[PDB]
């Protein structure tokens, strides 16, 4: 179906403990495929997925250089941010960036992204039109003015419509065994007596990929959204994810509850119930 490629940057200052650390991780959908850490013994882009290993040595040298240059540029970005916000050089600060593209089943660009944050808050972001910007405050507005003057959006757009989609398409083909395979969730409902008046029904979804999934409990056909405990989807460590939804139900009324599961790896949504 649809696919995405995203690069995530994290630049962290640490006054008194050396220069700011710069990390980059790259993903195709929910699969990590490349990493870079300026604190590494010999910093360089490293493969994290089998299908990216075939990229030649030229690819790795070029990718590593981009990250090394980025390390220096983001340390300067951090210094600039301090000025824009009138902050002292004593505190630790963080700049983050997420950029990339989404493509459809046919491989055409669905939309591009280039978003930035400062200390966990929106800073500036490229609009979906790939030609204008949205600045979060008067500080980011200064960056916006510089970027509008330098036609940055036009350059981002060229990358997003070109190399971004072209490389993603190559990665999808080279990694079609995994990137183009959805693993359906293995499901089951557990029963845990709480007391004489209530019992807990927990609906499990395990071993699925991608991470996107919907788990809901219904009581007599009515969604129990407000009464369902939903844990955040979590990684199993073997590429797959896990998730569960629980509800407290009155003793003897277990059969009035049904768990519904939706996942792209499932031809049709599943309906489960406690099976004593």
């Amino acid at each position: 179906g649809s696919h995405s490629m995203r690069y995530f940057y994290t630049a962290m200052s640490r006054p008194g403990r050396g220069e700011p650390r710069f990390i980059t991780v790259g993903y195709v959908d929910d699969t990590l495929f490349v990493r870079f850490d300026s604190d590494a013994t010999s910093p360089r882009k490293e493969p994290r997925a089998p299908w990216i290993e075939q990229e030649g040595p030229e690819y790795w040298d070029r990718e590593t250089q981009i990250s090394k240059t980025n390390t220096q540029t983001y340390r300067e970005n951090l210094r600039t941010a301090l000025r824009y916000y009138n902050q002292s050089e004593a505190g630790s600060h963080i700049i983050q960036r997420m950029y990339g593209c989404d493509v459809g089943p046919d491989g055409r660009l669905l939309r591009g992204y280039d978003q930035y944050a400062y200390d966990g808050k929106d800073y500036i972001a490229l609009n979906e039109d790939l030609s204008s910007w949205t600045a979060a405050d008067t500080a980011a507005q200064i960056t916006q003015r510089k970027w509008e003057a330098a036609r940055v959006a036009e350059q981002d757009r060229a990358y997003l419509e070109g190399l971004c989609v072209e490389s993603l398409r190559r990665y999808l083909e080279n990694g079609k065994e995994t990137l183009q395979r959805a693993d359906p969730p293995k499901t089951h409902v557990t029963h845990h007596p709480i007391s004489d008046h209530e019992v807990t029904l927990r609906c499990w979804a395990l071993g699925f990929y991608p991470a996107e999934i919907t788990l809901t409990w219904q009581r007599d056909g009515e969604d129990q959204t407000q009464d369902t405990e939903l844990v955040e989807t979590r990684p199993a460590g073997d590429r797959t994810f896990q998730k569960w939804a629980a509800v407290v139900v009155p003793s003897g009324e277990e059969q009035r509850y049904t768990c519904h599961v939706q996942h792209e790896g499932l031809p049709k949504p599943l309906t489960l119930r406690w099976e004593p």
Partner: peptide, 9 residues
């Protein structure tokens, strides 16, 4: 593949 152009804040 990454975009090799970085623009200063």
């Amino acid at each position: 593949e990454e975009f090799g152009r970085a623009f200063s804040f």
